[PDB]
Design a protein around this nucleic acid. Structure first.
Lengths: 79, 29, 97, 67
DNA sequence: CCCTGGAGAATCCCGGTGCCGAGGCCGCTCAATTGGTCGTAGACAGCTCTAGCACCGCTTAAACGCACGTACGCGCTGTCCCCCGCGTTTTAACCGCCAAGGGGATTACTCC
DNA sequence: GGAGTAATCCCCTTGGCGGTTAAAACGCGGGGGACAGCGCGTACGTGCGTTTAAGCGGTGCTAGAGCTGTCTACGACCAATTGAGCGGCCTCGGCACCGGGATTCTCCAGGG
């Protein structure tokens, strides 16, 4: 029971560029930023699985996302 | 809007050009 | 056929997409990517309800900041749009590893 | 259960009597206020251990350097 | 060719008018008072002292031109590329709908 | 007379579908984005004739520094009482994006 990605849009990636200050496009705009997404997320989850496998313990409430992403290099507020 | 709303294979030979359409018919009507 | 110069209609696209709280990421498959990431190694998550929104908005922050840094490095070069080399410049200098 | 909201609206009445705000702003207030509390407590922990003097000046230095 | 008459589109001043909305208001309740007990961080007096700064007295290490002199910064110029514009279409998460067993808890019934 | 067996509640999942829109992509036109080589010169290139300073080493103590008696200056227990805002609710003021009304944004083919 697993699902996987299909390509990350022409339109929504285009709006991602639109709020990134982009009007036209090159051939290197849609796909690669998602590759940076995948690399950064794989690094942060690599650190997380190292943390949770060194001691073999689970996680805690939703306060983890702000701390883990702050160490990662881009955290969030909102609640 | 019909094209948007709406959305096995067979075997069939062919014959042409030089052909002897063969029939061994007792043509007795 | 009122077909005008691209870039100015792209400018009105930018104006529409950079005005309100509209979620520019048509991105429940972003959530499925997050699920594939999370269940790639472990299981039995049992997390909160709206945490998907928070993690996705952090994803948006990272990716969009990458977008602006890439566009700055692109106008730094002689190419206005997003180029992979500009993204390499924007990520390597950040200390990617 | 316990709400800082009543005290917050008391301060508002000190500032503005009849203004209404949103709940999302209240949640962001909770998050940022508490993380400021955590950071200010973390900053002024072992300063008294920098030299053999282990108060108010600890948190004063905390706010002096974080700001 | 400039300048423009005329063509395309699209959401800003205030509501839809019925409800979002923040923490006043009923007072009570649970860790604050003050009744006494109690020994620990911060520190005042205390004495020269670490390595070398005021002189003198330094030797060259950078720091400064010249005499040309010898290549590349930014855009002309070039194809070239090329991928959105935004309509249109098909992959594509979430949340009820179904009918069951596990099983933790929980007592009907009971029993040694 | 409280627990042992086991009959009860039940609700929650293990999973598969209605209903569903967005999610990614096509797709055609072109025109602005794609990325660079040259022009040439300006943008740097550079190595030896010409000096202040830098990092110091020749006395004497010389601003800050670590220094051991014996403490001055304070911050945290418990026990009967009690007030702050919390335990729960939803009151009257003012909401909340496309319409009444359309000038803006953007290009283009003739006036000129």
């Amino acid at each position: 029971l697993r699902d996987n990605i299909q390509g990350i849009t022409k339109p929504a990636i285009r709006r991602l560029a639109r709020r990134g200050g982009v009007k036209r496009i090159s051939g290197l705009i849609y796909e690669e930023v998602r590759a940076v997404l995948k690399s950064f997320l794989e690094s942060v989850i690599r650190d997380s699985v190292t943390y949770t496998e060194h001691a073999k313990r689970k996680t805690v409430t939703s306060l983890d996302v702000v701390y883990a992403l702050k160490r990662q290099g881009r955290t969030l507020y909102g609640f | 809007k019909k094209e948007n709303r709406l959305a096995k294979q067979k075997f069939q030979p062919n014959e042409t050009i030089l052909q002897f359409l063969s029939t061994a018919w007792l043509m007795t009507p | 056929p009122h077909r005008y110069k691209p870039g100015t209609v792209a400018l009105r696209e930018i104006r529409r997409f950079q005005k309100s709280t509209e979620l520019l990421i048509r991105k429940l498959p972003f959530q499925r990517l997050v699920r594939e990431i999370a269940q790639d190694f472990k299981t039995d998550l049992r997390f909160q309800s709206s945490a998907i929104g928070a993690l996705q908005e952090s994803v948006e922050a990272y990716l969009v900041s990458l977008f602006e840094d890439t566009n700055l490095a692109a106008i730094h070069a002689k190419r206005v749009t997003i180029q992979k080399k500009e993204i390499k410049l924007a990520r390597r200098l950040r200390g990617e590893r | 259960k316990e709400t800082y909201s009543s005290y917050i609206y008391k301060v508002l009445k000190q500032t503005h009597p009849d203004t209404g705000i949103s709940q999302k702003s209240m949640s962001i207030l909770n998050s940022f206020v508490n993380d400021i509390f955590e950071r200010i407590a973390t900053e002024a922990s072992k300063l008294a251990a920098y030299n053999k003097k282990s108060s108010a000046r600890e948190i004063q230095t905390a706010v002096r350097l974080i700001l």
